[model samples]
Target chain A: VDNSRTRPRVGHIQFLACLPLYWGLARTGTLLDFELTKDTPEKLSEQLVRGDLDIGPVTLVEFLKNADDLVAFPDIAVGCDGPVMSCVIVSQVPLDRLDGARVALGSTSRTSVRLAQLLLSERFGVQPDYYTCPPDLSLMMQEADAAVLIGDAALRANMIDGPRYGLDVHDLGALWKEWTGLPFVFAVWAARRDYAEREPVITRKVHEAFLASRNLSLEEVEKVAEQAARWEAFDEDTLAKYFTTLDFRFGAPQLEAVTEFARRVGPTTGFPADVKVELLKPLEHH
Target chain B: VDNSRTRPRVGHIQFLACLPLYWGLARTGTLLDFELTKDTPEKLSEQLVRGDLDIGPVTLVEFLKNADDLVAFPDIAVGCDGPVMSCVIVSQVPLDRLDGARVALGSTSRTSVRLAQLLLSERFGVQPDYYTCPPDLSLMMQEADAAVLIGDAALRANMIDGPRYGLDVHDLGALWKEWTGLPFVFAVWAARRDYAEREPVITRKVHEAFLASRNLSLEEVEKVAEQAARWEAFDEDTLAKYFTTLDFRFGAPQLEAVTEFARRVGPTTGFPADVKVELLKPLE
Candidate 1:
């Protein structure tokens, strides 16, 4: 390890998904100093893209946007293959009846919202009106026929057995996985091109720490989850499901899936027909 | 007046400052009927503080906790006096050094966060903390530095500004009145309670019409602001001061001084020892 004396300015969401990073920062022996700034995936990604951060766990969209400037970790990412208990499609009408209906988004998950848009168009050909709203599903359904909810709110909602108005629920991550038969990579830990060019060793240490912590946490999922739930105010059962559902690692499969996603939906969204795509990867360690 | 049969179910943030009722809804006969899910100086003075409401714009403190329960009336509110703003503080520390200080409080005023609790407390104390995070600087600060921030976020905070980090901006409304003093109240209507009571007239009208086409946009004070520099993400001068300092008709004060405020604070947070409260003239 370089054990260098420089603070790596790290910016990320202070959520359960980033627990490994938190543990890594806690355990690392002053190899890197930290400045933790909290933001949604979208906001954090935007800030990192603006060169405000040296390396961070940013949204996939942001990594895609600055592909030329950044590279992602090869083996570490936050992902899901089945019902991402944290992200959902909530609606008053049965999911099947939501063609041409209005939908509200929880505002935190732009990717999920886009995923839903693609799914809705492919399945029903109905364009939905989008509004930014809180994850109070019952109230959301009253205003719009459908809504997208994410994070702890969805888990808690699941425990409550949900609204009296029978709803059609769709798990966003699961939907993506089922449609593509490959895992959905919601987020990846990426580094700046400049940092990769110079300080590859420091980046490697951080990645190694992340990998170790994830293994430790996942091995004792039940206890790790119980301890993690103490900080945030969410239902215990929901937290349990949330902790268990995510498959937080990315590899060739996830990259291929993301590339295909862009391929399938890119034209529909008017992304360039010749939009060259890049899979941000870690610099080959010297 | 055409007390139209189909008026929208309106909710008011139950408080003493609803003169907008006279200008916006009452005169227009758009109110199906309104109630006080929340009580205020009038409900306090007359002993008539129990009724369900369709919606409420009660106070900023109340609004933050319950933005879900009530819809806001756009371009309307009880806001501050120029240098003061709607929420104010009678602080113990020198203006600049309150930062990083431990603060005590009295009543919760929700809008205090916007008033600079983080900035004020960050200045002095070690790990400076607030009595009511979403404080009511005016009331909360009494014990420590009495903060009186403006709206709904305050109710949860439950104390005025804290002691050590308190800032004595001019009595917000009064500071405003020195220039345009006009009364400043930070909220206007509410709705949760009355709907629960199954009031027909409510679901029929009040909430829908009150701020129907009003702009909720944040353009109240931009023209006077210096634009953000290329390196800057936001227009600091204006955003830090003006955008959040919007004054609304419903929120504007009727008079320069809060003689009524003196009375209200005394009973709730034990402000001035002797207080004489005025009455809101009832619906005509």
Candidate 2:
């Protein structure tokens, strides 16, 4: 077999948040069939939309924004039912007091920034001046009153920066869950519609492979957390807690959360408020 | 007050199809107080979107197409629950057999053309080669196998051309009602969001005035139908039937039809498949 033609191009999300999903993939023979390119969720979403990457975990808001061009896979997502240990806004002042204050929104993730905006505008009712900066919480705090941070930096900031720097850390997933009474999905696994249509069997195979890897990681999260600790600058206990808090499935409540999120922040972000997330047909439907 | 400052620039749909709504406005004192420009639904929708006209009864599809910018005024619309005798597809070939046939879609309408396309494609399962042509049935049929004729031309064609030219007429409203069991709204009264926000009082006034005019016409349909007879080529009886068949209110069924229409035809026409029709606040 020509490996160049046969191997599937998969986007690997380069973050500790996605550590559980890909943990078992590394140890399996299934990994041999995939061609993986690792990147941030924002970058991977862009690549997948531009057709550079075949399949990836797209940030929830970007998936809704580019829904017409992509089809999401059912049964898998990156979200939290209660709290995400990472993906937080570390503020110098309280969330309410940030009005007219300089706020630096992290340029890393897509959904968290929008979630922060809604948390400020609707939940808290404060309109603040926003600036986009790097995810380094210290550098971001140096520039503004509050900084929206995600990924490893957000987790570390939640642990260290809040204690040393005396900053308030507000988790966006907790804020969203509090407001909507539903779990918030940050990202979902999806394939470009044209690619899925052209390569149905490969799409299904990669989907099952990803799910199998996900299942193994969930069953042995402590083992996966130890692996995550070596790769990311975190203790095994901290990594284990992060993995436990985050959800890895697209169930009924998660689906409703996607619709509710779109209806609220969609019009401002160029998403049609009522546009639904289109899912690829299961092979049984086909 | 200066006439130019006070007068609202209104888009009047220039068809006998709009006869029932504006018929009473012509006879009442309301006519002199406003500025009205008469044109096709397609052209009027264009003018309204560019902010050239303050408000208009824009074709339903165009309203949905530009729903983000415009806010629909509820209670007043142009639609039909059963049949619109004035909007019909004059066909030389059966709908099922139009696969390779040349079909002339009227360029004047925004909704009917799409309705015709969906009718042929979904209902009959035929995809014909379509061309945009003027609503003149004789000219359109001469150029193609079938023609979607709207407004007064459709009524005349239904009455005369169907018999003389040996053409079959399919009422789009009747077809839609049969297919969806809901009334189809062709046009709705809508104003630009900025304009309405800045001039709420004026917007409400214009809305009430339009609704009041619509009410009087509906009450005196026979009287207004005769008035329409003088302006358009239709006889009084024909105009009365047209007026009676047409609905001028946006009820529950009509709103559902708008949603159903957009959901089905939106993706192919640059409309979001799930975008809802944005309506203005009803002055309580």
Candidate 3:
């Protein structure tokens, strides 16, 4: 504990969803206890898999994909019951007509891409010709009939061109609710299994920090929204609503959502339908 | 023969896809032999079920839905290989995210609705809160997150507001192709099975007229497109391209498409997976 360099390595998305976790730790000047690095959800996932980061909010699919190598921090997630304004399909056509049309997948998030594919194949009936691209609306649309954009870019795209261009924006969360009658989880907190085993105390502290951060973040929405607006360059109120639309609790509904998500996406990943989620039990702090 | 009211009752859609059938029969003064009526595909379907019309182009699902009562005319359909340019989902969101969103179903076509349902549930892994609405883009979008529009309205909605409004238009036909790797059939000609049994000659003649009309319509795409433009108020070139995109042949591929459509849509309709398409044998 004497050396400052003994801090744990933690990875997180650079978007608004991670604001609360970062803010809670930074406000207490306790962020120094960990090596914090920012990146896209997909990249953060890769880092976790590669042991670069001990714990972070990895994309839900990646957690499920590498479930064997990792253990989740129970009761923390990025989820929504209806529309999560940031994950959406901006298409030149309706959901039913999306067959064979070119669809540009967002490059920022792997979870949204899998969700889109499942929705496209299982819910919408038409399979799109999907390709990955940066979440630039104009460029994505120019190349494909529809584009999937996630996080801040998706929010900004809708706010800017929503009425201006009369874009058809389908919310992926809402879509999941419509189909499964349950909420959708985009990301969840977890650590590499070996890391959690080796640094059990640090792992529990990291999880406790996020759990505390989520609560603190909820109380300071206005502050978080204000700062996020300057960075994402959107209306403060919209950012606030975006945060509110996102649910952080990984309770029964979210557990069910993740389980169903695993079930739906399992076959595509060559995993069994009854995939199980492993969680690390944090020690009781004095 | 002396009385002017002896002609049989025939129902058809007022949209451009049916132009060839109407024009070919009308221009030749052959329409006089039938009591021609114009209505939406849904209405035509209802009238066929109610026995209001003896023979006409019925929505494919409606035809399949009431297969026990009706028999299809062989070798003709409103079908497409890839994008139908019509039958589409005009959304404000992506297909994957469309779970519990409100969707306005095009009240005109039953097949498109079922197709949308199957696509949404089977292929996309989400279900939409669907309600029927007239094919008015503004009105439909106002009521729901997305609208399912078929025929000319779908075409016009995309042409006028696609780029301007940045709409996500999904063609069901194109979607079917992507998922099933096959064409989609929107409509098919049919007569009441009882009527075909009762007036075999008239049924045969009606079938021949439509068959002949389809052949003539293909040869007169420019004329059909031009006249259709005046009525539907779309570009003649687009209409011509639209016509070209349509298959019109109820051959091997069309049969396979319809059968596949039936297999997919059958469970929802409470029908067996092996739903048989009843076709009327035209006199050789």
Candidate 4:
């Protein structure tokens, strides 16, 4: 097999938040032959598990449960210290008022689902029924007491007037920050352990590619904002402001935030208490 | 004669986008003598025409059509250079492709409706059958090949995937800017000519309040965003960004943009080509 042409396969979420990663990769030409695939965060997790992807930004919960098989890139992630705006629960009742109502969850993201669950449990001290559903406000509102919509869908539903649906809105990121006093880590880069061990050289290259992409993306956010505006409904300035709210560093504090999320959601979601994330340190190539 | 308690009866569009005006008025102690009322832009126009509102941000086309009876504030407006993401046409086909298809126009905004008309007429050289409709997406899509949704509804509908509806989305502001090389002004401050004449002092006070509000609103945009988040579902950050795109100053270039818009739209919409915008130059 010609190893030169067989570059590592990389996967990422198909959303504006992940554009910097793609923009950076394309601009730097870090991996000329690296195959890239885009999918929902949940699907990305399944793809990583199925060995269809060599490395990708798996939802934090997915990486936590499969820590033994997956190693996270120690320097890249997507998180928010306050309101994420894109992760929200549109409900007929306020956060503290809902005691036994059903909550419909968005199917595209496991991290948002877990974050919603933790919010309900910690903030309101209530364990309502949870079920999966598509991101339709009317349909979800009819089926459940409140509905959880992720990504752009959440942003749209969040704008729905509270009086219309007999519901109020709450940002999961805001709730998490209010409760935890720390940022909430939603997604991170991780590679299959077997692939990392087999191709350490390629693994290092992929990690460096993402790191460079993040650094360059943060610096050239205005350009990235224009790129994002072409596809997303948000204006360039709004997208630019949103990019500012996102933290891409995956250092000690980020790991701690991820750990806090896992610690709170683990017992209920069946994640083992002892499960710990294994970090993959980048190679010094200077 | 004691005029200290004479509150000028004012009306404005009841939307989050208009919150800055309210925030500014309340913050700067402008219009304490002004009893404020909130309604749709169309209603605000009707109220002003009926002598119900002393002042408000009436839709540009409405003011243009009734320019004989109204004069503009000359220094405040809401506009965008491109992709005013809140004013859009979601269609099954692109702009050039919608030659004979039906296009539903939103009833809330006369400015957006005229801009859309001018866009189709001047840019595409094709006019689809236009009808008035509420901002319900599924219903509008059912009734017409394309739908024009404004304000929050447009923002929500734009988020709908194009492929799902077998459609494409085009921002009217983006389209206008692309065609004419200028920004698009959606709304502007105006008052009934009779009211302005009767109470020049009160008019000056109202104008100063709005001007101060725009300055303070821009400075405290973060606070305005937070304030907007309470009633509307948008977060503070997104609202802040939306505010930044709005061009509030009604200067030479802005007036030129509006003049160009009126020039293009007036002929087809029965607006006199020579109808000039009368400015109440704020008391120097």
Candidate 5:
């Protein structure tokens, strides 16, 4: 929130999941205006809350957890209206049949972790025993009967790893969409309220850059899939499917969806039952 | 042409001109089979002729310049059936009015410069006074009444720099298409004939990778524009249009186009007028 520094300190999420949202900023030279550090959704949330960053994408739980200090941009996020193929539960058995079964959560997940628990406990009505583990499906499979995996790790398991082990992969986003009939938001761009309020011009610049990069990525989705395939043990066809299934735009439906998600996970986490994400108004001339 | 090396050395053109032609090979892990070197269409032709490269894209003149040692692939090229928006001529006056006027050629251009000269001499019947210069529209503006520009330089001049100087930007590819009623090929994929014959498997692999990458890039044109726009002083809409206007597929019409271009340029460059681009039969 301080105005002493000339450039804003921004956190970059180093993964293919964020490629669509942040690919063009550096190429366009828009990111040169800010100081950047590589980070994750979880760590970004922690840094954002601690005032270490001016803006970053944070897991939904963290966005909701520290509502006082953060204001989420109303336009964009990491989500899907239906199936998010990259975030799924790969199991040795059916989801409903996993009552009292051992479930391993991905270590890199915070928003996905809570969403999986909510879906398992309430949607399927399961009382599964849960534990966190590194997102290596081969190792996760050895430790637990079922596991929650997000990002490329999830896709690897859902497509090849789990299928090799004869395990079924259930998409939680599809389940939520079926139950609520709305888009599900997993990660939201949470900006520090005090900082954004202090620097409206810089905020607008950052906001437009973020939006442009995302649109640019979306426009070239097939290429993004190819770029993603370069680093993964996956084919471009599967990756192309995954990128299209994701929803980076946040809208009215997503707001209502996030509200419902907050409501469902309330009892499990003992957080507030009600929820309202601070909606930052859109910039006009950026 | 020797088959002793473990992998074939392929020349890579380091520009967005080839982005749509080779965007997916590395991603598909297909390029791992070949030894790659960064190069341009003109330089690749020289390296390919010197036996430094097993395969490369060569400027149209060079493709014709070495008909005995080199063979062109039948399926792909850098060309356009209509307007190649990136290869254009920026002028101080209307294009048809520039007869005997001083004209500046883009130094980085070989294919584009010849195409421009052919268009001016034959179609419009203007014997343009031509000389080469770096493709800076501002610098070329003061040097000549008109200038030939290609690639991103052409785009920069056509959109921003030329407009500021109130200069007219004419698309040479569009002019060629209109005059000859055929697609114009600027550059062709030239491979060493002996190298391809000695190792059919490697040739097939390289051929398929090139075809795959080209298709992948076409499937995602808008993103390429956005990416291309990032470094250039332009927007995605214009770039998207330019990319779509390009015809990477080499077909019968393109063959006819190349033949017409060859017949016209033969007199000026002192090359034989006859033309038949040896088609490496399409992999079955």
Candidate 6:
């Protein structure tokens, strides 16, 4: 699968969860040689849905939204069993008491905002005002009583200035698995079916390289921490703590979780109620 | 001037400076009896420029931006000297300081942002990050160290809050007058020339009604204070101080200042060096 000949260009966002995969694809000794660019996930998702990029780590909903149009690659995704490295709801008041208070949403992650809004409305009985906010929790806190932050920003904040009342919604993964006796999927490197079929070997190589690089990232977590710190405030200790909050793997349990999340929010994105995970092919060795 | 026949509908964004005009027009059978919707002068200006409106009280720049397409009503604008009762820049931090600070630009006025940027860059050498905000200073204060509040928001904040530091930039109208000596056009009630020419009587009637309303607004500074309370933490002493800082007439000095301002930024807006006050045409 010499992707350069037939495969579509793959774009990825520069987020920490996807950092290892990016590093694997680029490192001089990696199994795969690929062309990739770093961009905001929102823009990449837009392009991916438009059929511009054949494969990319888009929001799970992006692929789900165009389910007939795209498919997930085997053995490559980012998920967690407990608190994920990134994604959180920061509030001036406790989460339970956040009624009628204004909340800010990270413009990048509509999913997190929707989920938090659902949680807040169900628990508090009132919808807080939603405003777009940068990843800065400090700024969000100053403007609104609460804010939802995602990606590298959430990771660093958890490490440096921890949230006053951090709620690990991803902890729902365990509760979900225990209750439904199934796995959950958060995100994946998905591609259109035709594109994936055309370049299966290269895709496998890329996935393997990504896994190898994920291992290396944990080995050299300090170095990754150095890179994250240049733009935001964080140290190795914080980065290490970030590495612990969630599990990242492309496995059956993770896929189950992903399908479950889609099941709950299917109608919100126009997915059918009877929709089951019938189409998603399991990984070869899973 | 029976404007009901040929006049195109216009929207008015009733800012405090011109709130009196709209309120007056509505009460004195000018706006209510005529063919325009009393909205904020900002919305009116936008609609007027988009040609949805025949005429509305718009910022000078909006008129200047589409100079060829629009015309200003002479002698019917809200101009001021030391205290033009609308618009101000409030800051939690001194203007000089605020390195990574955010400032909210009032939706009604983009000029304040541009002008504030220029003034900050030239004088303080500090360029703050900015965002658009609702008229709420409380929310504005949360994310931003300062807010460029305009119209009633600016008036109420300066008056009611008794800002430790309030610099009414339009008071530069006096300096403008001293410098060049021409009538300044602050908030002009402008119409497209073709629209005005088509409905001459209605245009004149609208203009008379607007002027008459301006007079009515003057009689109730206290009432304005009360209204200002809705937006800001308003009180009589603050309203009085705010009132003292605002003036509502496009006198000769103010015009000179406007021309000078137009000249300085004129090149960017494609105002030829030869652009004249001819942009403003009197209704016959």
Measured by lDDT, the strongest candidate is 2
Over the stretch A1-286, how does candidate 3's per-residue lDDT look in tens digits? 0121245788868776666556666543344355666788889899999988888878888888888889888888888898888888898788788888899987787888889889999887898888887778878877888998998678766666655677898888999899989998899889899988887877888788777767877888887677555434566897788888888888777888888888878888656667778887755768
Rank order by lDDT, top first? Answer: 2, 3, 4, 5, 6, 1
Predict model 3's lDDT versus the native.
Answer: 0.79
The lowest-lDDT stretch of 10 consecutive residues in candidate 3 chain B is B1-10
Encode model 2's per-residue lDDT on A1-286: one tens digit a residue. 1112345678878677776666556433344356567789999999999989888889988899899988888888988997887888888887889889998987887899999999999999999999887777767777889988888788888876687777889888888888878998999999988889888888888888888888877888997776445444567898898888889889788899999889998999988999878886776653
Clash pairs, model 5 backbone: none
Worst 10 residues of 6 chain A by lDDT: A26-35
lDDT of 5 at B14: 60
Give the per-residue lDDT of model 3 (tens digit) for B256-279.
998988887787786666878888
Q: B11-69, model 4: which lDDT tens digit per residue?
A: 76666566666666655544234566767888888889889888888888888889999
Q: lDDT score, residue B104, model 3? A: 91
What is candidate 6's CA lDDT for residue B104?
Answer: 78
What's the lDDT of the predicted structure labeled candidate 4? Answer: 0.77
Q: State the lDDT at A189 in candidate 3.
A: 89
Interface RMSD of each: 24.2, 36.9, 37.5, 25.5, 12.2, 33.3
- Say which docking band candidate 3 falls in: incorrect
Write one digit per residue (lDDT tens) for candidate 2, span B1-284: 11223457888886777765665564333443455677888899999999889888798888888999998988889888978887888888778888989999888877888998988899989899988876777678778988888887788888767878688999999999899888888889999888898888778878877888888778888976654454345578977887888888796778888888999999997789898777777757
Better-scoring candidate (TM-score), 1 or 4: 4
lDDT of 6 by residue, B110-211 (tens): 555555555566556787887886777767766777877677666656554434444332322343344445434556777777777776766666666666
Task: Give the winner by TM-score.
Answer: 5
lDDT of 6 at A31: 16
Error of 2 at A13 (Å): 0.6
> What are the TM-scores, per candidate, against the unseen true structure?
0.47, 0.49, 0.49, 0.49, 0.51, 0.44
The Cα error of candidate 4 at residue A22, in Å, is 1.7
Better of 2 and 4 by lDDT: 2
Local distance difference test scores for all models: 0.51, 0.81, 0.79, 0.77, 0.77, 0.60
Per-prediction DockQ comes to: 0.01, 0.00, 0.00, 0.01, 0.02, 0.01
Q: Give me the runs in candidate 5 sitting further than 4 Å from their true place.
A: A1-286, B1-5
